[PDB]
Each structure stands twice: as structure tokens, then as C-alpha cells.
Design an enzyme around this catalytic site. Sequence first.
Site, PDB file in Angstrom:
ATOM      1  N   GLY A   5     -25.287   2.805 -63.046  1.00 21.71           N
ATOM      2  CA  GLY A   5     -24.796   1.436 -63.238  1.00 21.71           C
ATOM      3  C   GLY A   5     -24.064   1.214 -64.506  1.00 21.71           C
ATOM      4  O   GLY A   5     -23.344   2.053 -65.007  1.00 21.71           O
ATOM      5  N   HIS A  22     -29.845   1.709 -78.370  1.00 25.24           N
ATOM      6  CA  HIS A  22     -29.072   0.485 -78.453  1.00 25.24           C
ATOM      7  C   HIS A  22     -28.699  -0.005 -77.063  1.00 25.24           C
ATOM      8  O   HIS A  22     -28.859   0.713 -76.053  1.00 25.24           O
ATOM      9  CB  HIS A  22     -27.838   0.699 -79.357  1.00 25.24           C
ATOM     10  CG  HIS A  22     -26.871   1.705 -78.880  1.00 25.24           C
ATOM     11  ND1 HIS A  22     -26.045   1.490 -77.810  1.00 25.24           N
ATOM     12  CD2 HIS A  22     -26.586   2.955 -79.318  1.00 25.24           C
ATOM     13  CE1 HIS A  22     -25.268   2.545 -77.632  1.00 25.24           C
ATOM     14  NE2 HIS A  22     -25.608   3.461 -78.516  1.00 25.24           N
ATOM     15  N   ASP A  54     -32.204   6.213 -80.407  1.00 28.76           N
ATOM     16  CA  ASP A  54     -30.916   5.520 -80.466  1.00 28.76           C
ATOM     17  C   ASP A  54     -30.734   4.640 -79.252  1.00 28.76           C
ATOM     18  O   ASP A  54     -29.683   4.658 -78.576  1.00 28.76           O
ATOM     19  CB  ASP A  54     -29.752   6.473 -80.592  1.00 28.76           C
ATOM     20  CG  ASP A  54     -28.504   5.768 -81.171  1.00 28.76           C
ATOM     21  OD1 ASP A  54     -28.631   4.678 -81.689  1.00 28.76           O
ATOM     22  OD2 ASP A  54     -27.450   6.401 -81.087  1.00 28.76           O
ATOM     23  N   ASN A  97     -27.077   1.894 -74.132  1.00 27.69           N
ATOM     24  CA  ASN A  97     -27.793   3.042 -73.579  1.00 27.69           C
ATOM     25  C   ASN A  97     -28.846   2.640 -72.560  1.00 27.69           C
ATOM     26  O   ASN A  97     -29.688   3.485 -72.169  1.00 27.69           O
ATOM     27  CB  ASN A  97     -28.395   3.861 -74.700  1.00 27.69           C
ATOM     28  CG  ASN A  97     -27.352   4.686 -75.419  1.00 27.69           C
ATOM     29  OD1 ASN A  97     -26.264   4.935 -74.844  1.00 27.69           O
ATOM     30  ND2 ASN A  97     -27.642   5.094 -76.666  1.00 27.69           N
ATOM     31  N   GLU A 148     -16.944   6.951 -72.232  1.00 25.16           N
ATOM     32  CA  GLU A 148     -16.405   7.897 -73.213  1.00 25.16           C
ATOM     33  C   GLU A 148     -17.233   7.833 -74.449  1.00 25.16           C
ATOM     34  O   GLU A 148     -18.003   6.855 -74.669  1.00 25.16           O
ATOM     35  CB  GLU A 148     -14.955   7.603 -73.573  1.00 25.16           C
ATOM     36  CG  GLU A 148     -14.760   6.302 -74.350  1.00 25.16           C
ATOM     37  CD  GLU A 148     -13.342   6.035 -74.705  1.00 25.16           C
ATOM     38  OE1 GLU A 148     -12.407   6.404 -74.014  1.00 25.16           O
ATOM     39  OE2 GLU A 148     -13.147   5.396 -75.804  1.00 25.16           O
ATOM     40  N   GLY A 149     -17.114   8.834 -75.270  1.00 25.70           N
ATOM     41  CA  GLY A 149     -17.650   8.832 -76.609  1.00 25.70           C
ATOM     42  C   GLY A 149     -16.996   9.936 -77.400  1.00 25.70           C
ATOM     43  O   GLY A 149     -16.121  10.643 -76.898  1.00 25.70           O
TER      44      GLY A 149
HETATM   45  O1  LIG Z   1     -18.500   4.491 -72.574  1.00 22.58           O
HETATM   46  C1  LIG Z   1     -19.169   3.738 -71.876  1.00 22.58           C
HETATM   47  N1  LIG Z   1     -20.119   4.144 -70.985  1.00 22.58           N
HETATM   48  C2  LIG Z   1     -20.768   5.402 -70.971  1.00 22.58           C
HETATM   49  C3  LIG Z   1     -20.842   6.239 -72.066  1.00 22.58           C
HETATM   50  C4  LIG Z   1     -21.619   7.382 -72.039  1.00 22.58           C
HETATM   51  C5  LIG Z   1     -22.299   7.689 -70.870  1.00 22.58           C
HETATM   52  N2  LIG Z   1     -23.157   8.705 -70.572  1.00 22.58           N
HETATM   53  N3  LIG Z   1     -23.631   8.594 -69.310  1.00 22.58           N
HETATM   54  C6  LIG Z   1     -23.101   7.541 -68.755  1.00 22.58           C
HETATM   55  C7  LIG Z   1     -23.443   7.157 -67.365  1.00 22.58           C
HETATM   56  C8  LIG Z   1     -22.932   6.030 -66.760  1.00 22.58           C
HETATM   57  C9  LIG Z   1     -23.371   5.690 -65.490  1.00 22.58           C
HETATM   58  N4  LIG Z   1     -24.281   6.410 -64.792  1.00 22.58           N
HETATM   59  C10 LIG Z   1     -24.744   7.502 -65.395  1.00 22.58           C
HETATM   60  C11 LIG Z   1     -24.367   7.920 -66.656  1.00 22.58           C
HETATM   61  C12 LIG Z   1     -22.209   6.881 -69.732  1.00 22.58           C
HETATM   62  C13 LIG Z   1     -21.418   5.723 -69.785  1.00 22.58           C
HETATM   63  C14 LIG Z   1     -19.159   2.235 -72.049  1.00 22.58           C
HETATM   64  C15 LIG Z   1     -18.036   1.803 -71.161  1.00 22.58           C
HETATM   65  C16 LIG Z   1     -16.898   1.820 -72.124  1.00 22.58           C
HETATM   66  N5  LIG Z   1     -17.459   1.512 -73.443  1.00 22.58           N
HETATM   67  C17 LIG Z   1     -16.581   1.146 -74.556  1.00 22.58           C
HETATM   68  C18 LIG Z   1     -15.145   1.636 -74.361  1.00 22.58           C
HETATM   69  O2  LIG Z   1     -14.920   2.623 -73.669  1.00 22.58           O
HETATM   70  N6  LIG Z   1     -14.146   0.932 -74.926  1.00 22.58           N
HETATM   71  C19 LIG Z   1     -12.758   1.315 -74.638  1.00 22.58           C
HETATM   72  C20 LIG Z   1     -11.801   0.402 -75.373  1.00 22.58           C
HETATM   73  N7  LIG Z   1     -12.091   0.398 -76.810  1.00 22.58           N
HETATM   74  C21 LIG Z   1     -11.104   0.774 -77.744  1.00 22.58           C
HETATM   75  C22 LIG Z   1      -9.757   0.525 -77.480  1.00 22.58           C
HETATM   76  C23 LIG Z   1      -8.769   1.068 -78.279  1.00 22.58           C
HETATM   77  C24 LIG Z   1      -9.080   1.869 -79.376  1.00 22.58           C
HETATM   78  C25 LIG Z   1      -8.017   2.660 -80.069  1.00 22.58           C
HETATM   79  N8  LIG Z   1      -8.402   3.449 -81.083  1.00 22.58           N
HETATM   80  C26 LIG Z   1      -7.449   4.240 -81.603  1.00 22.58           C
HETATM   81  C27 LIG Z   1      -6.152   4.258 -81.157  1.00 22.58           C
HETATM   82  C28 LIG Z   1      -5.864   3.394 -80.129  1.00 22.58           C
HETATM   83  N9  LIG Z   1      -6.772   2.578 -79.572  1.00 22.58           N
HETATM   84  C29 LIG Z   1     -10.429   2.039 -79.690  1.00 22.58           C
HETATM   85  C30 LIG Z   1     -11.428   1.509 -78.888  1.00 22.58           C
HETATM   86  C31 LIG Z   1     -13.481   0.055 -77.129  1.00 22.58           C
HETATM   87  C32 LIG Z   1     -14.281  -0.205 -75.857  1.00 22.58           C
HETATM   88  C33 LIG Z   1     -18.920   1.689 -73.484  1.00 22.58           C
END
Ligand SMILES: O=C(Nc1ccc2n[nH]c(-c3ccncc3)c2c1)[C@@H]1CCN(CC(=O)N2CCN(c3ccc(-c4ncccn4)cc3)CC2)C1
Length: 330
Positions: free
Chosen positions: A141, A183, A181, A186, A24-25
Amino acid sequence: QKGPVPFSHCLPTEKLQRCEKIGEGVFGEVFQTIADHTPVAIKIIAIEGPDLVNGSHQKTFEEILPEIIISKELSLLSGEVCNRTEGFIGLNSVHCVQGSYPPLLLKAWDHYNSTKGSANDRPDFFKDDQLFIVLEFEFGGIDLEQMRTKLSSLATAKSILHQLTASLAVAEASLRFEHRDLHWGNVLLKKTSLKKLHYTLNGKSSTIPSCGLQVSIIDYTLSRLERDGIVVFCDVSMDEDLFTGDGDYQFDIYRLMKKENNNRWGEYHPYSNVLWLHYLTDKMLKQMTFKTKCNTPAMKQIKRKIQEFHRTMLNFSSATDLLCQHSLFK
Ligand SMILES: O=C(Nc1ccc2n[nH]c(-c3ccncc3)c2c1)[C@@H]1CCN(CC(=O)N2CCN(c3ccc(-c4ncccn4)cc3)CC2)C1
């Protein structure tokens, strides 16, 4: 280009049923699914509407085009001849879709929220006129950050840095590309049974020992490239927030890029790729932790060479210069 298609065009029932959220983003959502026995990653971005989504305005189609263009150009390097690399994420397709969010994707969204948590709004507020861009990628991955504790050894680190350097060099040579970018979220890693990976830089082919992993670069938000003097780039000259971060060397890199380019983001400064590679090398030495330490002489020499890379690489002008001249790759 026959107008927008329904979600079912990209995600027929069985493909939809197999969707699991993986990322997500602010842009939206990323689902993994399967078709023809093969995993794919589906990135879904709302466009053209007036609602805030995840706190930000939606991009217009004109504004989403750069991402589409750059994603395609870098994917196509896998089929080129003089400047060939498979180290960017493969792009299978792009569609413009119209409709409310599929209930099956909301089910997947909820499962992720319950288990991993989400920073995003539940995407259940879209109407049947909503447009989206759906980008289908090869599955690349898991990101280097999530793999902080999962890699075998610094030999694996060297392979990753070599793969990244080679891919950036090829893209410099072909497209005057800067990622801007890169990081550690990515850099995606996935297993490969190939022992050696192949690239070609300005007509000269070489190989890189894989250490069992294939790297894929993602996320072109800030990226820049050109073809025939037409430059595609994200103009951050008036962004404030981008240059004021702290707590990680990542946020220095934005400032160091601005110093290098004199805040002129349309220009070509491949030194930015060197800066990101330095930031990644810094992560390899300081934040990554490996299952096997460098306990033998050959391994110990690899460690020393990666430390020497860290201390010297900022004196190179581009990824191409690093790849071709740096001792780490000889
Ligand atoms: O988002 C993530 N991966 C991405 C993103 C963009 C992509 N583009 N393409 C790809 C791709 C992947 C594989 N093969 C081909 C393409 C992407 C993968 C990673 C996995 C997840 N992550 C962090 C994340 O999703 N979190 C979720 C939980 N969190 C969190 C929890 C609660 C709250 C919150 N905020 C407000 C209200 C309530 N809770 C805020 C953040 C921070 C970490 C980084």
C-alpha cells in the site's frame, strides 16, 4: 547462488511491461508490478560498483546482507507459532542481478519524474557488468504520511497504533528487534476485507479490529535484531548528521535513542520501539486529519484514550510492555 542472473529472470517481459514506479530513496528505486494477478513491489539497489548513485557510494554485498537478513526474518514471522505476526512487509524473493538498467524501467522512471518529480539520478549510466540486489515484496500500500488526509477517523488511528505495537512486540519477543527508524513514511496501509487481524505473542493469540486496513512496516536501514547471540545492526555511533536534524519530532527520536543506548547500537534497547510509537502517536494527534471527527461518545472515548496513550506510553519499557499492560489495548 549460481552467480548473478539477468534482469529478465526477475522481470520477464510481461512483468517488466507492467512496472510503474512507486517509490525511491538514496538506495535506488521501487516499482510496482503484477504477476499471477497479484501486485508486488520490486526494490532495486545497485551494489559493488564505483559510481556514486544518488550522491552516495554503492554498498558491497557484505554491506547489503543485513537488509536482506532482517527483511527475511521479519517476513518469516507470518509463518511462526509462538511469536506470529503479519505486520512486517512480506518478502517474496531476493536476487542478485547483473546488467544495465532495463529500458522499460527507465521509461517508468521518466514517467514518475515527469509527474511526481525525483530526488534521484536517472539510472541510465550503469554498464552491463553492474550488479544489483532485487528484493520482491508483497505490495503493502501507501505510507501513513501520504495518507495524512485520507483516513476515516481516530478509530482507524487506534487500529494502526495497535497493529504497529503488536508487530513490534512480536518481533521483540522473537528476535530482540528494534526498528530504529519508524517514521511515518515507513508505515504502509492497504485495504483488507478482514474485520479482525491475528497475532500471537509468546504463545498467547489475540486479535485487533482492522478498521478495514492492514498495516505493513518497512525499511530496516537502522534496524537491529539477533538470533543465538549473533546481532545484526547498523552502527551509527560515528554518524554526525543523524543526530543533528530539526523541524520534526522525528529528529529528536534519533537523539533520544542515542541517550537511551549510550551510543552503543549493538545492545538491545526495546525502549527505542516505544520512542517511535510515541512519535507515531504524536503524528496521529497533531498532523493527521480525519474525514470524520469524534462527534459521538464511543468515538470521543477513543480520542481520550489515544491522548492518554500519548501522555503515558513513554513510561513503558518496550512494545511488549505497552501491548500487554497499556489500557489503550484492553
Ligand atoms: O518513496 C516512497 N515510497 C517507498 C520508498 C521505499 C520503499 N520500500 N518499500 C516500499 C514498498 C511500497 C509498497 N509495498 C511494498 C514496499 C517503498 C516505498 C514514497 C513515495 C514517494 N515519496 C517521496 C518522493 O518520491 N518524492 C518525489 C518528489 N520529491 C522531489 C522532487 C524533486 C526533487 C529534485 N531534487 C533535485 C533535482 C531535481 N528535483 C527532489 C525531491 C520529493 C517527494 C515517499
